[PDB]
Amino acid sequence: AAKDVKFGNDARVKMLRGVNVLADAVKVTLGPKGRNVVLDKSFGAPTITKDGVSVAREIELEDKFENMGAQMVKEVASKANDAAGDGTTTATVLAQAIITEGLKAVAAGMNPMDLKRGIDKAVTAAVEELKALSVPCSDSKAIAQVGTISANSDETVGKLIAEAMDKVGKEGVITVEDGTGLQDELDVVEGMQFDRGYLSPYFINKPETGAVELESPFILLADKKISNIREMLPVLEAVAKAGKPLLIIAEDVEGEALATLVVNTMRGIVKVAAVKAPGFGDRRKAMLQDIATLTGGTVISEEIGMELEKATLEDLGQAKRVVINKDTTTIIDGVGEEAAIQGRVAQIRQQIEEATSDYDREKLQERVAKLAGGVAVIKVGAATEVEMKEKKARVEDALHATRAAVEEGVVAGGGVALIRVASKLADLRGQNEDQNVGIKVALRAMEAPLRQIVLNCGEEPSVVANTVKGGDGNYGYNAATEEYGNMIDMGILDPTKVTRSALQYAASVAGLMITTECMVTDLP
Amino acid sequence: AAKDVKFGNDARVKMLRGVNVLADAVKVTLGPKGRNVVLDKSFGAPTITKDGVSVAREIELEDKFENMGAQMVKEVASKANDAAGDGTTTATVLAQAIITEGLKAVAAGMNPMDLKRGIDKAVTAAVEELKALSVPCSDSKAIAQVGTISANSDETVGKLIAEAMDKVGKEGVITVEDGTGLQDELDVVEGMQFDRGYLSPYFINKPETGAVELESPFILLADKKISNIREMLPVLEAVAKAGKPLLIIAEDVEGEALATLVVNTMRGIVKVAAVKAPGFGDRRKAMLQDIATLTGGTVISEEIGMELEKATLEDLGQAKRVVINKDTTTIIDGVGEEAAIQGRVAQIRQQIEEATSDYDREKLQERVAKLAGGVAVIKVGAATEVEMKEKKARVEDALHATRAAVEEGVVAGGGVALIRVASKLADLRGQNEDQNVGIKVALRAMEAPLRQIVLNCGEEPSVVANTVKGGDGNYGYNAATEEYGNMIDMGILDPTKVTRSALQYAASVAGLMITTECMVTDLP
Amino acid sequence: AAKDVKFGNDARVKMLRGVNVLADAVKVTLGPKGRNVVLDKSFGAPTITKDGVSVAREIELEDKFENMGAQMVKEVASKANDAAGDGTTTATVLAQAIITEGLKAVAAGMNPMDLKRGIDKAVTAAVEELKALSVPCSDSKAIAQVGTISANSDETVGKLIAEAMDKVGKEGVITVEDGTGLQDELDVVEGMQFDRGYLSPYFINKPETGAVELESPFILLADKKISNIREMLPVLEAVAKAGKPLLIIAEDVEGEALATLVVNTMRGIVKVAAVKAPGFGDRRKAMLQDIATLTGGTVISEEIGMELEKATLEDLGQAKRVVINKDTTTIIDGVGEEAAIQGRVAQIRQQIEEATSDYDREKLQERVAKLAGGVAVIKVGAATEVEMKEKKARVEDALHATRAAVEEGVVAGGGVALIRVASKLADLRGQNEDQNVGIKVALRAMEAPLRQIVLNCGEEPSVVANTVKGGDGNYGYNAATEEYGNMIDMGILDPTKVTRSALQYAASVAGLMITTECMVTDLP
Amino acid sequence: TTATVLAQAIITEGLKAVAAGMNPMDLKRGIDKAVTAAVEELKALSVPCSDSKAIAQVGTISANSDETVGKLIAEAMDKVGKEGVITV
Numbered sequence A, B, C: 001a002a003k004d005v006k007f008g009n010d011a012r013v014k015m016l017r018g019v020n021v022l023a024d025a026v027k028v029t030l031g032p033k034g035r036n037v038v039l040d041k042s043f044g045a046p047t048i049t050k051d052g053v054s055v056a057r058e059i060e061l062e063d064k065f066e067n068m069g070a071q072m073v074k075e076v077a078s079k080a081n082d083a084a085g086d087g088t089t090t091a092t093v094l095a096q097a098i099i100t101e102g103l104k105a106v107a108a109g110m111n112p113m114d115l116k117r118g119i120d121k122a123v124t125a126a127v128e129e130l131k132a133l134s135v136p137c138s139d140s141k142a143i144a145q146v147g148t149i150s151a152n153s154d155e156t157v158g159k160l161i162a163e164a165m166d167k168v169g170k171e172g173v174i175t176v177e178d179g180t181g182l183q184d185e186l187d188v189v190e191g192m193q194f195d196r197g198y199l200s201p202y203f204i205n206k207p208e209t210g211a212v213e214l215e216s217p218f219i220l221l222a223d224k225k226i227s228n229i230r231e232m233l234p235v236l237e238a239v240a241k242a243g244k245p246l247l248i249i250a251e252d253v254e255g256e257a258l259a260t261l262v263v264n265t266m267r268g269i270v271k272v273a274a275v276k277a278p279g280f281g282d283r284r285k286a287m288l289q290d291i292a293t294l295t296g297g298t299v300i301s302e303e304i305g306m307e308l309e310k311a312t313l314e315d316l317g318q319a320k321r322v323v324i325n326k327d328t329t330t331i332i333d334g335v336g337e338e339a340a341i342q343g344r345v346a347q348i349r350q351q352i353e354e355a356t357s358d359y360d361r362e363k364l365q366e367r368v369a370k371l372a373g374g375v376a377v378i379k380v381g382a383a384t385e386v387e388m389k390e391k392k393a394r395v396e397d398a399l400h401a402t403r404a405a406v407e408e409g410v411v412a413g414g415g416v417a418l419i420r421v422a423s424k425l426a427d428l429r430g431q432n433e434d435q436n437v438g439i440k441v442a443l444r445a446m447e448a449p450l451r452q453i454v455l456n457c458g459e460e461p462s463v464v465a466n467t468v469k470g471g472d473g474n475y476g477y478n479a480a481t482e483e484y485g486n487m488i489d490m491g492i493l494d495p496t497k498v499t500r501s502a503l504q505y506a507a508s509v510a511g512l513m514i515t516t517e518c519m520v521t522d523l524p
Numbered sequence D: 001t002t003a004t005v006l007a008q009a010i011i012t013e014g015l016k017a018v019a020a021g022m023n024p025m026d027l028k029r030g031i032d033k034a035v036t037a038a039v040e041e042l043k044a045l046s047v048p049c050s051d052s053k054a055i056a057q058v059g060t061i062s063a064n065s066d067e068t069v070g071k072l073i074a075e076a077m078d079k080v081g082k083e084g085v086i087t088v
């Protein structure tokens, strides 16, 4: 592997060229009145979308190094969506702005480490301004209000989201299911959600979601890392005759067993998926058991002397639904007996009695919440299947926004909040002159999302930015209606958390690029 | 896969070039005296046709992006035909006209978003003028009149179309079968049509039609998604022994079973086709049953406890004919007994009495119509197979025109209707100056189909258009006879619905391209 | 699948260039003294022939578009031969003549649509003149006279042809068989000929003929489309054991069974062929049965409940000979008992009494003729096999000429008739000036076959044409003898039908090219 | 500019006739004969221009419809007379 290596400006300029291509294409779709982009499939007609996230995913550059820059931004921007649910397009816009002006500063002979430090300082100061700016969203009115707005003026969608949170609680678990009929159903049923992803991207049966949905699947509980194919066979065949999907929970699965299942699921005999068990060490023992009680399943432990081959359907637990995304696994309506599950809760509540550690009482309390809290599930009813799934997508988008809105409140969505904060900290300075430059770059970059939106609309960015600066608080310009006033009242807003994370991620990658003196890649 | 990205003028110019190639070729065949096009097949001699749709299917460009523009137009133009039945070429002609003048306008420095908005207003305004212009077709005389015209001046074809509608109804189900003999037969037999397409395009045994015809096939009714090949094997083998085709209805079929059935059907031992069940969720449960009663078959449900493997011929319903197109499935002359079918209808009629809600009452009423209304069929008789088969194609073409004529009436078909409407709203203005320009582009573009018709004929486009402008209503020039008068009375007309659909689709794609800043494709 | 597309002159010029090479090479062999062409074989030495058909068949061009022009002419020219038996070369000559001037006319700026119309009018008028010019062939002396002249001045060939027609009838079925002995045998035996060709070109065991000859084959009669390999297996081996060819008559055969049979016959275990059954719908029910009675076989009907697997040799009819060409199938000397066949005729004669409709009477009558009339056959005898096979080819060529001569009479064959007709209607004019030009183009083109004949000979085309123009009726120049007089009396003539068919086909393709504005082909 | 246009139309149509298998020299004679007759027609059609406004109108039309030009020119010709010399 012969390496091509670039240093300083040759390296950084190449990244700049790469990032600009990615950002220039994606940014046009940011505003309510965005400009559509055309992507092309290998066999068939071209594809047009105003979705920045779809455009960004597809982008790759021939020139190594330039490609690297785009990928670096895509990685961080994708993360903002992962931790916020929106702002992926906004993060990229901000990243471009911070990077371009800051990058020029290093090329001008100014010190890069200080510029990063200055930018970070501006970012840290900026985040507090958003927090002061931020309007809380804790009550029923705000929960429904943000949910309906996100849902594109659909009051009913917001109403169920509020009801769900109201019932299970803000931190509770809410899931979305296809509607059995026209009426919308909100129900609380035994179930559990935990942090853990799928072992392979190949397992996914729902490409747009990036998640795996299974119908009334059997559930396998295991106490060891799976190092071999052979253990699965007697149970694997048994589920195959049943004609239903199989779900596996264990410490880890090795490639010899994992790879065959991946190949087996993809154009194969039985389509199954497996995930890692929640917790570690001593905790997984209790954690796995809670799931067993919930699904009415049997736990299999190597330590006990029980092996996977020695297992049957009776050992396996069941649930009506299970959905697995990139890092989260959740189950709906386990078949475990109510007496068993309620009884299990009593045992855990009793356990909480020692209160030996803040950690142990907290940890036990969390287990209670996962097992006894239950899972709130919403069915979406509609006149037609197309409307039903489409509405369902809208509900899920609103739900992510509602959770982000709840956690940190909300800010004006027209990119107004960045504008408002940028004008607010004109005063902040750094010890080194180079640091001051980093600060200006960061604040100047903040303005860009507003201008981009206005630019997309075909309106003058400078005129609108100037007027917005004049006004204060949540006051701003609504690009969609061509009006000025309180953006939140209008319905144009973004969760505080998403604006914060987009901005922070943009700064993290920008500083990271600024301090890079070398790039290594394979030759063309 | 490194991406080549085009944006701004570079992106738009390539789309323009791509659309012009597609439109220039296809437009020549639009007129009654349209010029022919030569397509060269990879095997044997070249093929000459005056059919624009055939030419459109063949058009692909070497230059990526430019190719995309053509494909984008083809997709939308095909859709107009799909929702209408004719005017695929007309839509393409209009698309070219709107795109070229509007695209020049964006290049000039005008705002694209406003131009789209202006065009949309003009398009929307044009549709009401078209509605007023339109001559209604509700009477037997009108039904026959449009039917015979479409059928290339064959009165007998028109007479049957009117008779069919007169029995089952305007919204009823009409099907065409090869004639058993010389005499034309119109019959009403038990049968059902529903809006569900075929999972695999490979299933089609009739390449010109794009539909699947089966003779006295067995019918499988299932209540689950099919993910495994093996369930099908005992029933599958049983039908093969029979020596005749098998039809499958269920939630959906996965690639594991679908791919093998597709391969099994093409150059394989048993050739069968499958479609999705009508309705959704709770609703499908009753509808699948309706089909079962109609064909004398047995419904199979997972919930009940019966599996596909545990099934036999006695469990399968039968019909003399079934035909499946790209998005519709219909069955003819099911073997279900009259006592069962009529009784089933009574059960549904009884259900209607509850009247809890309009949605459920109506929904039940729709079920009654499908199950009890019956399916009218047409057999076409001739002394020679060539005449018989050719006549059948003509009947079907006339039928689509008659349905479109019925639903929205008819308009002069010489391109005259676009001319008449364009002249009528010469005072329409937008807000922004750019919006006004979009309006002029849209109305000006309307003229092109007339001019194209006359141009193909080798006659003066401007002089004929000038005289046509002078006249009022349905007055215009008949390209076929080189005469002026009422176009509808001359036997030249298009359904109101096809003219509208062509115009609307052309505007949708044109505006869509105008608003697109960036295009993405793979490198050469 | 990128496409290269040409419009107007760029498209038309390529067709012109393509047609000219096809026509320039083929035209040299048209005269009795025609020049020879050298075709190179992939294996072995080069081949020289004066046969225009072999030359034309072989020609293909590198330049896409130019190739299309040649192929377009070849298809059309081949069709003239298909519907006339001769004039394949003459059609191409006429096509070149009309195409070259017509293309210049469009190039000159005159309207193509009108030019086509003018040419067609000239064609229609010229055909009418040809009909008046033509000397009818009705009586035995004319029948024998044309047969002997076609047969290269052999009286015996002519004598048998006249006798055959005089026996079974002008419209009856006459076949040619290898002579069992030295003497010529003309016999009338039970047999049937119907319109229907072979399903696969691969089946042909006689490549010069393009027909399939089978000796005393077993005959399978079936009433369903055959889509499966399996039904033939029990019957197929039984014929293999026999060591004789098998013939199949049914609705159709699908690629599943057809493709395997094609491979099986070609370089495989059993060599057999299958054709489509005559008639359609209930008509075929009667048509298949007549054949069964004729061969002593048993018809197998799905509706009866009988299956191909359930069939044996006893259910198969037999005939001493069967020959299948591109669209004609005939059987000779079927086994079927005379009492059965003759009795079957009695049932049909009885059926005629119903007289429900003119169509039914005629259709029943046709069945009588096919069965009761019998098939007249000719055994060609000679001392040596080389003389015998050669003589047989000559008989077949004479037979086609005799059928054409019978249907429309005969005309001078030196291309004199085109000369005579072209001079006769110098009067004809069109409403549009462009049409008048088209008329001259068509008339002028007519002269070329005469000139080509003289040109090939080595004599002045203009001097001979000039003298011929001066004369009247069938008077003209005989290229073979270099003399002037009545061409028909001199032994040189063409059937009226071949002259007409060549001329009309040339006109059809020429006009078709003239109105073409676009050509599509794959890149080099 | 007007003369050039006539050459354009005559030539294109004339060549087209030549293409149509016609002797060009005869076509030239036809053209020349038609032209001679056309010239005679113009002499009969011509209306005398003697008043100042008519002179102004030709000046205005010649000067790409500039009214001021026609106005100023008419004044000059009237003043200097028939044989007067006017320059710019």
Ligand SMILES: Nc1ncnc2c1ncn2[C@@H]1O[C@H](COP(=O)(O)OP(=O)(O)O)[C@@H](O)[C@H]1O
Pocket: D001, D002, D003, D061, D062, D063, D064, D065
């Ligand atoms: N407003 C007008 N309307 C109609 N014809 C006009 C108008 N103005 C000028 N013309 C005519 O067109 C001709 C060409 O104008 P011009 O540019 O002066 O060409 P020349 O340079 O005269 O070929 C004039 O001689 C006149 O007959």
Ligand SMILES: [Mg+2]
Pocket: D061, D062, D063, D064
């Ligand atoms: Mg001038």
